[PDB]
Amino acid sequence: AETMPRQNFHQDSEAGINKQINMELYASYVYQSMSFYFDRDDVALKGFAKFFKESSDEEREHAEKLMKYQNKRGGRIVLQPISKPDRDEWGSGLDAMKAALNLEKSVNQSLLELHKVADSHGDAQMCDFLEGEYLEEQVEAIKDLSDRITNLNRVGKGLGEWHYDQKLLS
Amino acid sequence: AETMPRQNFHQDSEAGINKQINMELYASYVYQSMSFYFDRDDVALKGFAKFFKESSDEEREHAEKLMKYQNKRGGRIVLQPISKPDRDEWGSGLDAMKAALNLEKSVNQSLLELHKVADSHGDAQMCDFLEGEYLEEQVEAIKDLSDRITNLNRVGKGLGEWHYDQKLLS
Amino acid sequence: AETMPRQNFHQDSEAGINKQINMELYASYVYQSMSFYFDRDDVALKGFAKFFKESSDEEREHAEKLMKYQNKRGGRIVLQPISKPDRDEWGSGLDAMKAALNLEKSVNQSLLELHKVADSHGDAQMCDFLEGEYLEEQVEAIKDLSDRITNLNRVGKGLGEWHYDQKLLS
Amino acid sequence: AETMPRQNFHQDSEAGINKQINMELYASYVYQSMSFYFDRDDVALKGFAKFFKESSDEEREHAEKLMKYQNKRGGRIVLQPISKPDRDEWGSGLDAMKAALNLEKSVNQSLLELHKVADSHGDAQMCDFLEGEYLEEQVEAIKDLSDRITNLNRVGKGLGEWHYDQKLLS
Amino acid sequence: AETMPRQNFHQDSEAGINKQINMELYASYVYQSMSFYFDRDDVALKGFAKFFKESSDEEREHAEKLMKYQNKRGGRIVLQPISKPDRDEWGSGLDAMKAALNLEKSVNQSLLELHKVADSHGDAQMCDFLEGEYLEEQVEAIKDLSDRITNLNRVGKGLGEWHYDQKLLS
Amino acid sequence: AETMPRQNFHQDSEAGINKQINMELYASYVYQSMSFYFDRDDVALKGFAKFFKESSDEEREHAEKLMKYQNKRGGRIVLQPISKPDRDEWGSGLDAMKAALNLEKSVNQSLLELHKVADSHGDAQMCDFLEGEYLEEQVEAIKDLSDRITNLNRVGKGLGEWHYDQKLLS
Ligand SMILES: [Fe+2]
Ligand SMILES: [Fe+2]
Ligand SMILES: [Fe+3]
Ligand SMILES: [Fe+3]
Ligand SMILES: [Fe+3]
Ligand SMILES: [Fe+3]
Ligand SMILES: [Fe+3]
Ligand SMILES: [Fe+3]
Ligand SMILES: [Fe+3]
Ligand SMILES: [Fe+3]
Ligand SMILES: [Fe+3]
Ligand SMILES: [Fe+3]
Ligand SMILES: [Fe+3]
Ligand SMILES: [Fe+3]
């Protein structure tokens, strides 16, 4: 019945990992949409384009790391459609950053619930895996985006947004 | 209003590039599934894992190139769900290559359709874009996969698949 | 006789190549004028100066590539007066970018026209020459100018124009 | 029935590729004959020897490119005898250049008709392969040889031919 | 009324600078026409091609120097059409050199009269700018071209012209 | 007259050199065919591909050395059609090696024949030329192909052929 490697890895944890993989892929797709939106001729903010392209890349990397963890523990990857983002268009650099903060907080709460599932089944290894690989970077990300929101509000619309975008690129 | 850059770019073409983007994303997700299946403990062919990870990355890059093209011509990117692959498990290395060939032929026919759409609207720049970025690569990939199928049948299962896999990795 | 090299090169294509040479020379002269205007003591925007100087050079380079193409195909270069630009003065940096976009779109239409002539006469080589040498760089330029216009509107007049110009220079 | 890679590749195009491969071989052979003739003791023009040696190699390379193309699209190479050249001796340097121009014009017309065959069957990839790999080179070569005829008539026989030949070697 | 930098800069001198800019452009265009003519398949003198290409660039550079001068003194650039050359074809290498000598002599007389205009208005800085930037180069070029006419008559037609041309390229 | 360089070079030797040139060209074309066949999608043996491509080149190189020898001795090169190969398809790698051995032994007999002609006419220089340039490399090649046949029989069909081909490539 069990896969060869499998040890102290609960079915509830396995299912949860699969759900987290879909969420991280979803987040990647939201950031992809935002990145390409920022390169529209009528938006044209190359720093935001670049910032969200990297964020898309990172989210996909997170998903791929969970995929490999699943396999390593002897679980089985089950993929689901990657739902399209809620929006086609993402407003101002400030609007988009706020949107990113909300997305990262959603991702974080899912990871925190994932850790809770690990605790529940006394999976000490999975707890550590989640702390080291995701929780630490989530808190860093969330602070980073928050600082960006405060600055985007500080600089204002127009020239301020342009100058913040040039600093992103730099 | 029309977008500021837009010139000689038909709505038919715009819509068809959006469908092509989805399709390339779908192909990327198929290859991602295959790549991760090949690293299961009970499959464990790292060359196939590598080969399909690279193919997933290439398909995604094709999607992104189309996304930028859309923007450059002044059309608007419209994203749809990326549907999950047909299967969760992909058989032998031979089986998976056969599956890859059928996927790439489906992708090629879509690109040739895309070209015809550009032809239909006398979009000389788009024809060139598709010829140079996609059509040449696709013929090469199709031939490559075909060569791999012949060899996977030549070597047979067991040690043959194993040795073929090692040569993939190297 | 026909010239020694002449093969599958229609008189209609030959005349049209000559018309396009004149137009690319015209475009070069417009951008020369712009470039110089931006160095007036009462305008003094060195980045705009540099940007339109590069534009003038590229247009002249296009004209020269067409001259050489004419000769290569066994056609005969026929030069016409290079008409003075539409203006002596070119307004703000935003104004000048909008003027450039209009120019580049008129040039692109002329190039697409030229490709049409090549199609009509079943001149495969000429089509390819136009596609690879002019059509791709035209769509890039039109997107680039469009992005600039968005950003010049974004930053506004005064300090914004100043800061935009510095970044052109960088 | 079909080869595994075969897609959008017409029988007519396949047969015509095979005819073109024979023609490129035949041109290689003509140039080989000319090259060797120019190293006869009673001819002794090493520049002409080297020039036609290079041309022979290029033609063979063209044929071999078409051979790999055939295979890549899933067509089947079919080789025919390579007929001997119409002459055993090729006259003056000027005579040989005129003879080369005619050959290259015959080859170019064949490539133009091959492009038309691809057009007829809506084979966009084949069209691009011919344009990029053969048609551009052919117009270049036809111009080059025409310039050489002009200069060989300019310099005249005897010392002129000797000097022209040294410049070829240089 | 006056531009901010304007000091000791007469209206007459300003208008005359604008006339000189047109003349330098017109000379550039003549040399461009000659350069391209020499790369016709039925002319085919690459040394002459290169030589007149260089001369075309220098003349354009002269014009652009006068444009920046105008601006620097606080005058206003006024551009006129650049008339097409009096010929479409320029004969032998010797014919073209004779034609270049006449052109350069016409240009030099114009520069000498421009210097007189500066003299007339006691513009010491303008005098020095013309002497150092234009008059010295012109006497050098007039000597150079005269030496070339002498040698082109020396070597004679046919092989002589061919050898002269190679030496130009060298 | 006899040609200027001609000394101790019999008509019989001259004709035979021409026959050998044709045969070496024939052998080159056979190995070209083989080389290309091994790149078919349904054959796909890149090592065999590479090995017969080198063989084709070496045979052509032999042919060219004989052409130059003909000329050097004051003989006159007479070219004949290069007959198409015996097959269009060349079976397994073992099959193709056995076909090559037969070819090489037929070529060697022709070369030994040629040396005999040189002996008959007491042409010491020609004998040496044949010995040092062809006979030694023929005996090496025939041993090399024989070793390959033994090993292709040793390894068997399927995986063995595959592994042999990889080592050809290495
Ligand atoms: Fe192309
Ligand atoms: Fe010896
Ligand atoms: Fe994440
Ligand atoms: Fe995250
Ligand atoms: Fe793709
Ligand atoms: Fe693809
Ligand atoms: Fe242009
Ligand atoms: Fe342009
Ligand atoms: Fe060729
Ligand atoms: Fe060719
Ligand atoms: Fe000048
Ligand atoms: Fe001057
Ligand atoms: Fe041989
Ligand atoms: Fe041999």
Polypeptide structure, described:
This is part of a larger assembly, with six copies of chain A (170 residues). By secondary structure, chain A is mostly helical. Chain A has a single domain (1-170), classed as Ferritin. Helix content of chain A is 74%, strand content 0%. Chain A contains five helices and no strands. Chain A has helices spanning 11-37, 46-73, 93-120, 124-155, 159-169. The longest helix of chain A is centred in the last third of the chain and has 32 residues, at 124-155. The C-D interface holds C 3-5, 7-8, 71-74, 122, 124-125, 127-129 and D 101, 105, 108-109, 112, 115-116, 119, 127, 130-132, 135-136, 138-140, 142-143, 146, 149-150. One fe (iii) ion binds at residues 59, 62, 107, 138 of chain F. The site of one fe (iii) ion has 5 residues of chain A, from helix 1 and helix 2.
